[PDB]
Amino acid sequence: LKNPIRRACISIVEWKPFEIIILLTIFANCVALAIYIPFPEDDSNATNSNLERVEYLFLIIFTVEAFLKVIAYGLLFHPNAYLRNGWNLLDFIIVVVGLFSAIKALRAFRVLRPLRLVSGVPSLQVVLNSIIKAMVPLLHIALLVLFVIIIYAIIGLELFMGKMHKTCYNQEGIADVPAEDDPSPCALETGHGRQCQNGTVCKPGWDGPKHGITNFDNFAFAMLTVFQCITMEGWTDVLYWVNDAVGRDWPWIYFVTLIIIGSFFVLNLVLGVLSGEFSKEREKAKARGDFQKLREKQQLEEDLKGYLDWITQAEDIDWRRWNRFCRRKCRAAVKSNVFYWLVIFLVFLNTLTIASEHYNQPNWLTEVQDTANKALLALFTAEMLLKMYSLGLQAYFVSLFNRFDCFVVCGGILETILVETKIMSPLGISVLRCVRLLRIFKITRYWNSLSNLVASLLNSVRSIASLLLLLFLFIIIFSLLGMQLFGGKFNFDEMQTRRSTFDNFPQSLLTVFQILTGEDWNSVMYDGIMAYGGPSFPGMLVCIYFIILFICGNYILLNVFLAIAVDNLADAELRVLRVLRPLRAINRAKGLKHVVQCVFVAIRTIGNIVIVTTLLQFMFACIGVQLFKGKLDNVLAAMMALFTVSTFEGWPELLYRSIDIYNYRVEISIFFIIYIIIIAFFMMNIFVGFVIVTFQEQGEQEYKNCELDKNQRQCVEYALKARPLRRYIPKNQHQYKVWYVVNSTYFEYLMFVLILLNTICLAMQHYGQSCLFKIAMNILNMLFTGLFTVEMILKLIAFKPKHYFCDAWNTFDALIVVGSIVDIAITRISITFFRLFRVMRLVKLLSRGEGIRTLLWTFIKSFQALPYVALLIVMLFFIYAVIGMQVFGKIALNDTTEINRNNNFQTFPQAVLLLFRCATGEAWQDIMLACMPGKKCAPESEPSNSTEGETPCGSSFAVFYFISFYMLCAFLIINLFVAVIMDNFDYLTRDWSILGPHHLDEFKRIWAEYDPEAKGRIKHLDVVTLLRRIQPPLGFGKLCPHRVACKRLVSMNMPLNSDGTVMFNATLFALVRTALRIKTEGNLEQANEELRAIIKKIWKRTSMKLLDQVVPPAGD
């Protein structure tokens, strides 16, 4: 605290150019660290030598800036988070520089420098703050995944402990396989791993993972494997591996349960993000009403144009006289609808003429195609001057739509004039055809169903710019960190050209992008860990770097998808055909027939959008193939055919294959971006249309309130049905005191730590097995069983066995006890559920998350509209499963040809498995490509001698059928998501911020619990002793028994039925009165209307009139 001169004279240096120069310095540092040519070890080629010295200048300017800030602010620089981050970065940099100068791991902290750029730039701090704040309330949800990612993993340790040790090394350290087949053990019960290679040896070894990484031993490896499986990428590979290793049909249930739990968790996270976004899309947005401001702006524009037309009419209604007379006729003629129809027909005909190019290269007609184009200019000019003559000079020119048309036509005529002469790289025909596409924008003026969409697309870019910049900066920092960590260490002791590397900046950036997309990232991570950190205790430090790079990346992309949701918010602002019974049976809900009707009535608009996108593709393909891709399918079908393998699963495969003409017009790939991006918007816009359709399907079911209020009506109808309970407690006081004290936070914590160390005994079981650790875990298991028996004995007798089988959680722990006593009576595969019971005790931790279990109570109990969609999806599976049997019979299972014993189809359960695998999108393109007309299918039948060279297996129709199946399944799961989010809208997106009605319900449950006496008639001298604390949020304040004693004892009359008898229902009604607004005695109008309209229109209580016997003491 010192401000005579220096503090006053140093806080003045806060110029805008000062921050500009600081940002320029940061950008220069980022560029300097960008190249930093990596070397194996200390190669001073005069480049890194100078980059070493530049760091001195950067450090000194940063530290003088920090000193200025510290002097200016004193003990206020530190509390700010970003200032503290910058100070810590600077301290680390100066410390490492000093340590190096005194005499290289800390150099990676320099990579953290670009983050400081976001510390000062506006319009980015707010975005990052909103992003980090949105995910906080959902953090608890993420914790659940941890439990899951442990639980099932433990199951594997029980069932797949060292099941990959046995191999099929042919002679000595070499398996009898082409380095691809899993050397499954020569099991005593044959059927899997037969290893019939005419001379085989089955010996223990490591022939599982490509590097011995994802083996189920070494529990951390099991966790890595289950995490890799839970991301929906390559789980079929490990499923086939384990099925070949141990046997068929036994373990698939585990993976199916894992995948369905993962899907449910994804749904839950999406609903949580929905609630987080809705908490701000309406609140604080309807307040300022910026949408109303935009509506006012467009209304003002419309009114201005109308009044200007009025003024033009007024001036026109009265040398020059002939010109004025012709002005009226010119202004009247252009407004005729016949003229507009003729003009639009001419424009469409000309656009068809310029689009008549069918990729041919003739000469007799191409010349005819030339001159007419020039005439089109006249056809695109006559209106123009008329709009400059019929309408005002400054009126028509200023509309933000027709001005674009003027620019387009002027550019087109100038380009035509230019291409009339010679020009290198003309592109004139391309841009002329592109502006002919813009003629359809006039067609877009009519039928505004696309004009509104394109206006929303134009609007959304300004908001999405910040998010895309943040994502680009994020991938930049992560690419820099990846380049620093490896720096060309991808030797692998091999020669084959790896598809990715971290030696140069662009290749590292594209590798990071590919990892973020999740395509083949597992193999890249395996290679990265095997480069230096071989499987061991310190070798896993690399692996975590990948994991974060996915989640913190993907979530952001999902947040970008949430931004897309915000953009959406911006867009919202003949054999066995006897199965007809379900069609008649499912006609009861009637909640989806309207959905089908809306979909099949909007399919026309969907097809029109598909057609216009196909026309755009035709234009782009014509331009590209006429200008490039010169041969040393079709201009409107080749892109579609590529898209059949480029559905966002295969375009990364295209990049993967093309990373090896070569660079001749690679922009098509980026075109394959933009088009897909256009789809990724317009289809999303169609989905946004579907959103509106869902808003019409389910969002229009709000009907009329027909009650006193909107939320207080819900409170009244919720607090009038609440009834008091008793909660009987037995006579045993000592044992129940032991329950209250011992069986409490202490007991649950000790149970959690003991089961955790039990897992450390079983989850962390020794790799392979050792006799010492074996007997250690045996005796520890005996001790655990003993302590479990002791705890259940003290929880059984002390709980008054009469009351033992009453509570629901008591029955749950009773089931746990019965599992334990099964354990002690059997202490064995397929019966070792008791150990799972121990991991089932981990599920008990979820109970301790009562605050989150309500979420579960709203999901698993949400099975009200779920049965209808579930029946629809299972009948879809039935109809699409039984139909494939006869058409794909004799599937021709063969080893290592993508159709094998694991890929078998003739068996019904395996066919279901295959169709489920295709449903999730796990490389179903290969499945589609595995059924060709020329492929032989089980040449065992008598007329299969290939006499005519014909394979009796067409199967060239499953592509369209499976595409339709994928679309239907995606639409149905979207429908179920909409159903569940609508079911939980009055639960999650409610007023849960501070004073949500569910908080009132929880406090009602507290009232049912907070009064242990349960005497029914609680005295006024007794409620002050215990019921003094009523409710913090709803109550007036912490001035018990009543903060407003006068109001709460006069308006709510002091209850004195029997020595101050208070009724639970009467007290709840009093709390409602505190929430509602009715005055003291003499409120006959509002109070009597509320209490007598109960019979008719407020809360139907014609029966159970007991309220009209307890309220007259208080209210009636």
Ligand SMILES: COCC(CCO[C@H]1CC[C@@]2(C)C(=CC[C@H]3[C@@H]4C[C@@H]5O[C@]6(CC[C@@H](C)CO6)[C@@H](C)[C@@H]5[C@@]4(C)CC[C@@H]32)C1)COC
């Ligand atoms: C009482 O509250 C309702 C009321 C009336 C208006 O209803 C709105 C409620 C949210 C709702 C249904 C609306 C628009 C965008 C909808 C989202 C589009 C995204 O599409 C998905 C589907 C899966 C992905 C393919 C893309 O993301 C979802 C995550 C997202 C979505 C289905 C979540 C729910 C959203 C309309 C006032 O609310 C403003």
